[PDB]
From Swiss-Prot:
Cofactor note: Binds 2 magnesium ions.
Residues covered by region (Exonuclease domain): 133-385
Residues that hold Mg(2+) 2 according to the record: D141, E143, D315
PROSITE patterns found in the cross-reference section: DNA_POLYMERASE_B
Organism (species): Desulfurococcus sp. (strain Tok)
Swiss-Prot/TrEMBL catalytic activity: DNA(n) + a 2'-deoxyribonucleoside 5'-triphosphate = DNA(n+1) + diphosphate
Gene: pol
Record's keyword annotation contains Transmembrane: no
GO molecular function, one term: exonuclease activity
Region (N-terminal domain): 1-131
Protein's name in the database: DNA polymerase
Length: 740
């Protein structure tokens, strides 16, 4: 199994290194014979003898064109000739290319910014992560003493923990009694201990959380002074700290540094992500955080410390198992796309599509377009972008659309190379946007999308016919990845930095989308007696007013296999679900309840950061009276009861606690217990009645006596409780005033 590729240089020449892991042992294939190159379109062949003499310099030495050969290719569905120019070292390219294209006989130059090792993987047709191999993985984390007045680097490494299928321990230079900790002389001897560990297990994959921006940039700095050589690469080098966007990323030769942060900030959507945050949504339960306890352990020798140890092995374990959760999808994405997991786990879907197109382009001898320069990219930033029935309804079906966009792309053959072509004998016309797409031949993108979809279907048959749990799981992920990629083409067409950019294609796919949803919703109403209540870009909610639940489910099935044989191409409507009751507020706000009594809402619940218990309980009760019981007036009543108790200081002070000027206040009775507070802390308080603004006197929930402190009743009624139900009831005709 190919893990990755890079290159080094001897006496001015590149040498490719492919890191493999096959049948138990690590291997390194070297290749001294690959050559860098680019392309050029010349106004007349006679100019090459001029171009072969252009020159530049690097490291004080002269750089030239090695060889030049005339070649036949395809550019946007039009045959054409170009010259392939070779060189000696890949870095020669960045230093001589500009000159070559500012020559008069040059229309343009192509494929001059494809990194050498990826160029190699694509041209030699090698595909990383392809086998059936078992890779040893292992995570690790460090803990450093907070030195208030920072100077990033200053302050030893208190702890460092790792995690493997074989347990999970912690190593330290202090004394601590626990069946899983380790104590040694100094931090230096700690760091040497750490290195000796990895050297022993020799992991193929190292897992971390934000390891690209903290953990490696620390173990390093505080090692240049402890006088130790932080060696981890199977080649004996130190981790290579590179630069991606405006932040950084770290690489470890021979291995694979998997940083969860990027993936998670893309696979799971949350308001504020955090190791303990993201750990709960993945599979069940909590962990603990926000310490200033490091300060306590620093001042006392005894303990507090023995608790902080737990924190560590926990970061370490919570890390090893989340990584074990997102590795499969990222590995299949790598195999599907043709690039390493290091790069794939750190890129956007837009880039995944690009890397996929460049490979196919080479495969089919299609020359690639260039990325946008400052101005082109400047233009490409001018963006592109009915009402729901009102009231309470019942016996509702939701009809889903299967692959809407990629479906339209294939059916109408929408591609940059088929756009408004001259002399086209057969073509389709884009709805309101009159663009003509030629059908005299298959379009570049369309063909590839078509091949992808039927591929997914062959994997599904295989997944439904295999009986082994391990193969079934593998085929399942491979199957989902084709889906993620396929549903990314539409967005790609409108991606400013995209090589195969096409605004006429995007607007068109969007226009056809509305025509199809329009005609489908018209059929079901005029020929089957339904009434559409809400519509999305894809599916829609509908029902037959005053009919039995089974009468609606069955009538909807009759509709499906009546409209599909009538729909062109691969598009289909698919039964999705049934709901007993629901109401739709605006273009993206609604609430529904399934038969099992489960309630779902979109854009209605608390998006706050300062929510409280009593505010969350009341909104839930309002939604239950309406959806589970179909009683609007009962909801309205429930909201008055609550504001009444809360106005008569009767509400149990427990449900009033909140997490994260009022803050400036909490920082006082806290800075009293000698507890300092900076940006990453725990702020749990309760609002009280005070001599100033209605929401500025609060104190830690600790300091609370049912006879020394009362609670600011109006803060809860106005800032919190009402704005948690106002929008829902505003849809049934009520206002703020009918709630107090
Ligand atoms: Mg950490
Ligand atoms: Mg830790």
């Amino acid at each position: 199994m190919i893990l990755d590729a890079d290159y080094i240089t001897e006496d001015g020449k590149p040498v490719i290194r492919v890191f493999k892991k096959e049948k138990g042992e690590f291997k390194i294939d070297y290749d001294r014979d690959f050559e860098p190159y680019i392309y050029a379109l010349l106004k007349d062949d006679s100019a090459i003898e001029d171009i072969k003499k252009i020159t530049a310099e690097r490291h004080g030495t002269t750089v030239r064109v090695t060889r030049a050969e005339r070649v036949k290719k395809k550019f946007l569905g039009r045959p054409v000739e170009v010259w392939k120019l070779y060189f000696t070292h890949p870095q020669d390219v960045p230093a001589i290319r500009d000159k070559i294209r500012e020559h008069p006989a040059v229309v343009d130059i192509y494929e001059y910014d494809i990194p050498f090792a990826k160029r190699y993987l694509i041209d030699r047709g090698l595909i990383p992560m392809e086998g059936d191999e078992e890779l040893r993985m292992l995570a690790f984390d460090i803990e450093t003493l907070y030195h208030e007045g920072e100077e990033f680097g200053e302050g030893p490494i208190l702890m460092i923990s790792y995690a493997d299928e074989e347990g999970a321990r912690v190593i330290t230079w202090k004394n601590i009694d626990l069946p899983y900790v380790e104590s040694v002389s100094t931090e230096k001897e700690m760091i040497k201990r750490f290195l000796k560990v990895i050297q022993e297990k020799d992991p193929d994959v190292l897992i971390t959380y934000n390891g690209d921006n903290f953990d490696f940039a620390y173990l390093k700095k505080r090692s240049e002074m402890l006088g130790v050589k932080f060696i981890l690469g199977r080649d004996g080098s130190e981790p290579k700290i590179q630069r991606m966007g405006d932040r950084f990323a770290v690489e470890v030769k021979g291995r694979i540094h998997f940083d969860l942060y990027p993936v998670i900030r893309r696979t799971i959507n949350l308001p504020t992500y955090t190791l303990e945050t993201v750990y709960e949504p993945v599979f069940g339960q909590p962990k603990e955080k926000v310490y200033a306890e490091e300060i306590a352990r620093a001042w006392e020798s005894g303990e507090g410390l023995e608790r902080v140890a737990r924190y560590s092995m926990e970061d370490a374990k919570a890390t090893y198992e989340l990584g074990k959760e997102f590795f499969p999808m990222e590995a299949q994405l790598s195999r599907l796309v043709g690039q390493s997991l290091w790069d794939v786990s750190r890129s956007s879907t837009g880039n995944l599509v690009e890397w996929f197109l460049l490979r196919k382009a080479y495969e089919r001898n299609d020359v690639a377009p260039n990325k946008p320069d400052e101005r082109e990219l400047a233009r490409r930033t001018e963006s592109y972008a009915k009402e729901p029935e009102k009231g309470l309804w019942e016996n509702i079906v939701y009809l889903d659309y299967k692959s809407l966009y990629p479906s339209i792309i294939i059916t109408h053959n929408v591609s940059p190379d088929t756009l408004n072509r001259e002399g086209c004998r057969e073509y389709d016309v884009a709805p309101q946007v009159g663009h003509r797409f030629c059908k005299d031949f298959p379009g570049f993108i369309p063909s590839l999308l078509g091949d992808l979809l039927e591929e997914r279907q062959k994997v599904k048959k295989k997944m439904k016919a295999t009986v082994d749990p391990i193969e079934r799981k593998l085929l399942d992920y491979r199957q989902r990845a084709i889906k993620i990629l396929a549903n990314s083409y539409y967005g790609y067409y409108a991606y400013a930095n995209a090589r195969w950019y096409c605004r006429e294609c995007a607007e068109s796919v969007t226009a056809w989308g509305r025509q199809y949803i329009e005609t489908t919703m018209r059929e079901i109403e005029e020929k089957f007696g339904f009434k559409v209540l809400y519509a999305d870009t894809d599916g829609f909610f509908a029902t037959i007013p005053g009919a039995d639940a089974e009468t609606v489910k069955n009538k909807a099935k009759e509709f499906l296999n009546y409209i599909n044989p009538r729909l062109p191409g691969l598009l289909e409507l698919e039964y999705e679900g049934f709901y007993r009751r629901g109401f739709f507020v605006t273009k993206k706000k609604y609430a529904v309840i399934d038969e099992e009594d489960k309630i779902t809402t979109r854009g209605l619940e608390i998006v706050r950061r300062d929510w409280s218990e009593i505010a969350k309980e009341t909104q839930a009760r309002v939604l239950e009276a309406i959806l589970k019981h179909g009683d609007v007036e009962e909801a309205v009543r429930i909201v008055k009861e609550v504001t009444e108790k809360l106005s008569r200081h009767e509400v149990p002070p427990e449900k009033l606690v909140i997490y994260e000027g009022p803050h400036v206040a909490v920082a006082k009775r806290l800075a009293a217990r000698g507890i300092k507070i900076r940006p990453g802390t725990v702020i749990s308080y309760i609002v009280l009645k005070g001599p100033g603004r209605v929401g500025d006197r609060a104190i830690p929930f600790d300091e609370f006596d049912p006879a020394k402190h009362r609670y600011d009743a109006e803060y809860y009624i106005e800032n919190q409780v009402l704005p948690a139900v106002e929008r829902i009831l505003r849809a049934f005709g009520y206002r703020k005033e009918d709630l107090r």
